Amino acid sequence: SRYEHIPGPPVLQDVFLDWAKKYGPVVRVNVFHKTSVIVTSPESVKKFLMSTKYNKDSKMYRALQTVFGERLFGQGLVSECNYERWHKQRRVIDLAFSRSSLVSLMETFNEKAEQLVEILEAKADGQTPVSMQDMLTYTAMDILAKAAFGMETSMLLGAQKPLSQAVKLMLEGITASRKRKQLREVRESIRFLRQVGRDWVQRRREALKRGEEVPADILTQILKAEEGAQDDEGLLDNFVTFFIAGHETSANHLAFTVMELSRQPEIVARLQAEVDEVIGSKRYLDFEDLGRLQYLSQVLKESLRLYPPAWGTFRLLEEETLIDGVRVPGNTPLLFSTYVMGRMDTYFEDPLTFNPDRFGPGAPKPRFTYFPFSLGHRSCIGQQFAQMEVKVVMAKLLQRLEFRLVPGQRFGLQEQATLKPLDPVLCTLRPR
Ligand code: HEM
Numbered sequence: 001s002r003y004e005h006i007p008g009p010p011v012l013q014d015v016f017l018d019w020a021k022k023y024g025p026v027v028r029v030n031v032f033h034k035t036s037v038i039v040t041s042p043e044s045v046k047k048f049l050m051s052t053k054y055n056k057d058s059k060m061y062r063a064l065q066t067v068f069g070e071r072l073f074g075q076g077l078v079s080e081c082n083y084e085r086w087h088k089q090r091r092v093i094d095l096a097f098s099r100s101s102l103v104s105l106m107e108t109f110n111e112k113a114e115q116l117v118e119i120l121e122a123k124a125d126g127q128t129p130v131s132m133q134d135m136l137t138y139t140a141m142d143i144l145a146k147a148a149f150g151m152e153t154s155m156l157l158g159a160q161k162p163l164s165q166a167v168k169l170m171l172e173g174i175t176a177s178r179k180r181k182q183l184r185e186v187r188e189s190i191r192f193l194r195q196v197g198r199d200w201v202q203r204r205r206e207a208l209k210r211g212e213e214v215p216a217d218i219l220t221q222i223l224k225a226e227e228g229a230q231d232d233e234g235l236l237d238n239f240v241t242f243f244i245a246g247h248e249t250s251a252n253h254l255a256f257t258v259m260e261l262s263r264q265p266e267i268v269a270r271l272q273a274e275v276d277e278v279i280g281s282k283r284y285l286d287f288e289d290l291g292r293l294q295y296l297s298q299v300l301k302e303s304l305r306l307y308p309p310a311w312g313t314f315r316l317l318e319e320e321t322l323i324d325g326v327r328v329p330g331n332t333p334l335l336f337s338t339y340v341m342g343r344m345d346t347y348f349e350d351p352l353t354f355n356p357d358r359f360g361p362g363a364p365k366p367r368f369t370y371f372p373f374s375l376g377h378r379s380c381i382g383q384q385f386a387q388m389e390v391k392v393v394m395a396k397l398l399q400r401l402e403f404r405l406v407p408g409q410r411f412g413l414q415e416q417a418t419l420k421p422l423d424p425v426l427c428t429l430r431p432r
């Protein structure tokens with residue numbers, strides 16, 4: 001009743017889009033456990049996301065913390081909602097995301113991208129159906145495992161099928177809650193994931209002791225954040241957090257980019273030409289190469305406008321506040337959605353047209369209407385990691401292969417924690 005005065009109704013993101021267009025920039029939604037208010041003006045985006053006065057709503061992030069009673073992300077970097085506890089771990093883990101840290105990861109990006117293209121090239125007979133969704137998730141997972149944790153998962157070669165199963169069941173579990181044996185499959189998968197964590201951490205600890213060669217990475221920092229903690233729960237929260245966050249969205253963004261580009265032959269021809277000019281035949285992209293893939297950068301940004309895997313974020317409004325002429329009561333989750341704003345014609349001209357030129361030099365940058373990595377203090381710690389890795393993978397594909405989507409494959413979305421292609425992006429391939 002306390003929310004009844006707010007405009008609202010008497011893939012869910014698409015329903016939210018319809019509601020925002022019909023009811024304006026502040027709309028009550030009663031889908032989540034609570035009533036929340038979707039705020040879609042750039043004025044609100046700027047006010048709430050760009051200030052440390054506003055923090056994440058813990059009632060919303062509880063669904064990441066714990067799933068069917070099993071600790072999943074716990075109080076890790078994504079799901080910790082208290083500013084001070086968040087800040088303490090952010091500053092330590094930030095060390096793994098410096099320019100100097102990221103530059104050293106180019107080797108791993110190159111090796112796994114090369115392995116993926118060699119695998120695809122062998123199937124490029126213009127006939128064999130290849131799930132690009134699957135191949136890209138395996139590459140993303142193999143990259144993350146090696147880069148962040150020093151482990152070789154070999155999913156690209158069919159290894160670690162249980163591990164991929166567990167991630168899949170746990171993602172479905174997030175959405176399920178947000179019978180008998182689905183609960184079992186989910187619960188086990190989460191424990192599996194945490195048990196993997198304890199394994200690698202034990203391995204890392206063994207290596208360090210008789211001082212084997214142990215290169216500084218994300219794991220180094222998450223360990224450092226927990227130095228002198230009372231047990232390993234905080235450590236394993238971040239293991240799982242980075243295990244999942246460090247591949248799932250990257251994979252999704254890759255899959256969506258490949259899917260969309262399969263109907264964009266003129267953009268594909270421009271991307272192929274850019275890659276031919278900047279890297280040529282070289283089998284390795286350097287760091288300075290990446291910055292020269294300017295058109296590719298723009299394409300990837302446009303892909304994230306229309307297809308953000310992580311569609312938005314929540315903040316807690318503590319005190320009753322006027323928001324764009326609406327009285328929003330205190331103790332209210334505010335939902336921000338780059339998916340919704342990306343598809344509104346008040347913010348983007350012809351919003352459904354895929355146009356990389358929106359992100360060209362000399363184009364007015366979108367002011368608070370576009371945030372696929374979020375904004376402010378709680379923006380994506382892995383944004384530059386992701387940007388580098390997806391560029392490497394995309395550049396290698398474009399260098400070497402032509403993709404055609406199998407007819408019958410759809411362009412629609414599903415929701416499994418994140419947004420991802422409904423279909424497996426089944427393609428036939430030919431060498432360039
Ligand atoms: C295209 C790929 C990626 C996208 C679209 C993405 C998107 C996002 C978004 C929207 C948030 C804010 C979440 C919220 O408000 O609840 C976020 C935060 C985060 N992302 Fe990502 N992410 C990507 C890749 C990565 C990678 C590669 C890593 C790690 C290797 C990562 C780790 C995180 C973490 C740990 C946070 C929490 C940051 C904090 O609150 O301090 N993400 N990301």
Ligand SMILES: Cc1ccccc1C1=NN(C(=O)c2ccncc2)C(C)(C)C1
Nearest residue numbers: 244245246248249310311312313417418
């Ligand atoms: C944050 C978010 C908002 C809206 C909808 C979904 C998500 C998720 N992000 N996720 C990540 O792993 C992730 C988080 C941050 N950077 C990269 C990946 C899931 C836990 C899978 C779900």
